[PDB]
Amino acid sequence: SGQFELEILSMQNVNGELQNGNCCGGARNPGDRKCTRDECDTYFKVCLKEYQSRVTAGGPCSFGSGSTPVIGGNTFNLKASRGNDRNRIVLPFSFAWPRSYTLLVEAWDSSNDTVQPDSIIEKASHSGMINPSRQWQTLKQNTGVAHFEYQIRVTCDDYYYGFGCNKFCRPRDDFFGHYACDQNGNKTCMEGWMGPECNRAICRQGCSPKHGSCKLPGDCRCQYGWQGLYCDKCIPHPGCVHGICNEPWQCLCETNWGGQLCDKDLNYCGTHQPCLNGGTCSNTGPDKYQCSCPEGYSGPNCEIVD
Ligand SMILES: *[C@@H]1O[C@H](CO)[C@@H](O)[C@H](O)[C@H]1NC(C)=O
Ligand SMILES: *[C@@H]1O[C@@H](C)[C@@H](O)[C@@H](O)[C@@H]1O
Ligand SMILES: [Ca+2]
Ligand SMILES: [Cl-]
Ligand SMILES: [Cl-]
Ligand SMILES: [Cl-]
Ligand SMILES: [Cl-]
């Protein structure tokens, strides 16, 4: 999600005094009060926590804490230097960044090779607001005897967006989405795709909303029983001749066509003209008729003469 980073820029402790007024090491040469015996072994402690309207010097470091190894003597300047792992403190976070925070930074002196313990040189504290940016914010602690400069920032981890580094967005072209990310981490769909995660293919222009569907953009796949470019037309019953459908597998007959498959001619007389030698045809049912034969003509079609 994100990272709160702090970089030490410079320290200035001309004499080599701690918070308690004493020197780093031993004796202070009388009169001029110069500390000469030894230089401080300066390291930095950092504590990051929830915003406090009224700052406390003690409390749990909610968002994180860390310390630098000894990075210098009494005085150092790293303001034109690059800044490495020894002079910087990284504090990662997975929660959404609240913007408001409380930061404690302290310069300390190492005393592990002696009988006395590690002691505080100076202590810095502030509460503020900071948004995710690559741009460093410089802070000076100069109120006391010892002064130090540090800079802080909050950056979003890869694929994280917004003011809290919480909005994840990584681009795709698979069964879960077809999209690119924009500057705000919003999903902009590829050509042919739609929907919140860009997983709906846009069909053929005019494709049936009720009988057509897509898997890939452009196409129009027909529901079973529908057909045509737009899946607009039903498929009639197989074996249906001289028949239409409204719904699939129907076979609703055309005029003068009867039966299950509209194979039977209800107007055989008109279609074939069967009676010969001046006979009169009359339809007597499906593929049936009868002939009224003139005198001297006999048979089903008046074909028997004399
Ligand atoms: C686009 O991104 C902004 C800020 O990152 C967000 O507030 C907004 O809801 C997004 N717009 C859409 C249409 O998703
Ligand atoms: C039908 O009946 C036959 C017998 C003839 O009279 C025809 O002219 C008529 O149309
Ligand atoms: Ca020391
Ligand atoms: Cl403040
Ligand atoms: Cl300084
Ligand atoms: Cl996945
Ligand atoms: Cl979707």
Author numbering: 32 to 337
Please quote the paper that reports this structure.
Signals are initiated by extracellular interactions of the Notch receptor with Delta/Serrate/Lag-2 (DSL) ligands, whose structure is highly conserved throughout evolution. Here, we demonstrate that the N terminus of human Jagged-1 is a C2 phospholipid recognition domain that binds phospholipid bilayers in a calcium-dependent fashion. We expressed and solved the structure of a Notch ligand fragment consisting of the full N-terminal extension, the Notch-binding DSL domain, and the three adjacent EGF domains from human Jagged-1 (J-1N-EGF3). Our structure demonstrates that the N-terminal portion of Jagged-1 folds as a C2-phospholipid-recognition domain with strong structural, but not sequence, homology to the Munc13 C2B domain (root-mean-square deviation [rmsd] 2.7 Å versus Protein Data Bank 3KWT, 10% sequence identity; Figure 1B; Cho and Stahelin, 2006; Shin et al., 2010).
To explore the molecular basis of the effects of this double mutant, we determined the J-1N-EGF3 structure from crystals grown at a physiological pH in the presence of 7.5 mM Ca2+. These crystals contain two independent copies of J-1N-EGF3, and, as observed for other Ca2+-dependent C2 domains, Ca2+ is seen to bind in a cleft between the β1-β2 and β5-β6 loops at the top of the C2 domain, ordering them despite the increased length of these loops in Jagged-1 compared with other C2 domains. It is noteworthy that even in the presence of Ca2+ at concentrations that our thermal denaturation assay suggests would be fully saturating, the β5-β6 and β1-β2 loops remain highly mobile, with their conformations varying between the two crystallographically independent copies of the molecule.
